[PDB]
Design a binder for this molecule. Structure first.
Ligand SMILES: O=C1N=C(Nc2ccccc2)N=C1Cc1ccc2c(c1)OCO2
Length: 350
């Protein structure tokens, strides 16, 4: 098999074969590939006509992907057009078009994504002050998505999709609404990147805007610790790693959860344990015995003690932080902290 795909324009994974230097439509001059992804690719390009850099997202050339990309565009256009100043936490879709059988979304050019940021500081993690700054921005963002007329679930929050507007600055915007959808109009059950996946989704329960808040919890912790909080290799592993920190989930949730039996079992007395495990195998810490309080290093100089004796990393501060995250990681989506209240939390009080 060495077929030629799309008159030689595409590779075998439906991606457009990026060539640096190429000028499209006597307008966009393609500089370089900046990133790949299930959706396709993103390229750095200079827009002659508007005299500015843009980032163009070249969707795979396959109906399945195109159809999704269209929903994305539609949502990007509701958010961009919406009124109050909160609309500058969502990336600006400048325009979009078909080219060589690829749908292309032209975005404002932005800087690093929070993962690339983490990596540049060799995964020692960013400061708490800065983690707070991202925290506050994201929260306002989620409140924007909450406005009734939008009611948008992102469904894939994660460091790669939070980008800096400027490399020597702190201001940021959310990207990639490929998986996203409006409340009610929910059409997928396997959503969210595994590490950042919520319990409700894992359990195969129905889900709402709450699931993004969850992801944000895991993000913020990771951003400071340098390393993801629930690093599951698979759904079962992921659920156990959540249980390590947060315990068995509540009766009233597991009772209603279709996939509850993938991970847990119900004892005669109506209480839930983790599923019994092969004769002798020990692999996890006992439920709730991996206290966030130590992962964060609240009383021991922060994560890995790497903040020992630093300005702006007081124990009092870490406590405020722990509490916020813990309300972002509420098993119950009906009682998980909502943005309006998250913003009025002691961790943001100047
Ligand atoms: O919708 C998206 N999905 C993306 N996926 C992605 C792109 C690069 C690395 C990891 C993930 N990127 C965007 C948009 C995007 C928008 C503006 C940009 C940008 C990327 O790179 C920096 O400028």
């Amino acid at each position: 098999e060495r077929k030629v795909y799309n008159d030689g324009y595409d590779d075998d994974n439906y991606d457009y074969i990026v060539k640096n230097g190429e000028k499209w439509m006597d307008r966009y001059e393609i500089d370089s590939l900046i990133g790949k992804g299930s959706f396709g690719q993103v390229v750095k390009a200079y827009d002659r006509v508007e005299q500015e850099w843009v980032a163009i997202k070249i969707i795979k050339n396959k109906k399945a992907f195109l159809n999704q990309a269209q929903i994305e565009v539609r949502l990007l256009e509701l958010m961009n057009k919406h009124d109050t100043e909160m609309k500058y936490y969502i990336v600006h879709l400048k325009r979009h078009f078909m080219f060589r059988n690829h749908l292309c979304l032209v975005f404002e050019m932005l800087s690093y994504n929070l993962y690339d940021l983490l990596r540049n500081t060799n995964f020692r993690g960013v400061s708490l002050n800065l983690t707070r700054k991202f925290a506050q921005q994201m929260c306002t963002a989620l409140l924007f998505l909450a406005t009734p007329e939008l009611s948008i679930i992102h469904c894939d929050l994660k460091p790669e999709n939070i980008l800096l507007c400027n490399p020597k600055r702190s201001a940021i915007k959310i990207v990639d609404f490929g998986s996203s959808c409006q409340l009610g109009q929910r059409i997928y059950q396997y959503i969210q990147s595994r590490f950042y996946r919520s319990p409700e989704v894992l359990l195969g329960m129905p889900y709402d805007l709450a699931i993004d808040m969850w992801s944000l919890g895991c993000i913020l912790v990771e951003m400071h610790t340098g390393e993801p909080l629930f690093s599951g290799a698979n759904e079962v592993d992921q659920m156990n790693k959540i249980v390590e920190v947060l315990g068995i989930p509540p009766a009233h949730i597991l009772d209603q959860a279709p996939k509850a039996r993938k991970f847990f079992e119900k004892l005669p007395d109506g209480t839930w344990n983790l599923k019994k495990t092969k004769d002798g195998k020990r692999e996890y810490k006992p439920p709730g015995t991996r206290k966030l309080h130590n992962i964060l290093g609240v009383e021991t100089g922060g994560p890995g003690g790497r903040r020992a004796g630093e300005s702006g990393h007081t124990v009092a501060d870490y406590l405020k932080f722990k509490d916020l995250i813990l309300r972002m990681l509420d098993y119950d989506p009906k009682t998980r902290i909502q943005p309006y209240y998250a913003l009025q939390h002691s961790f943001f009080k100047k």
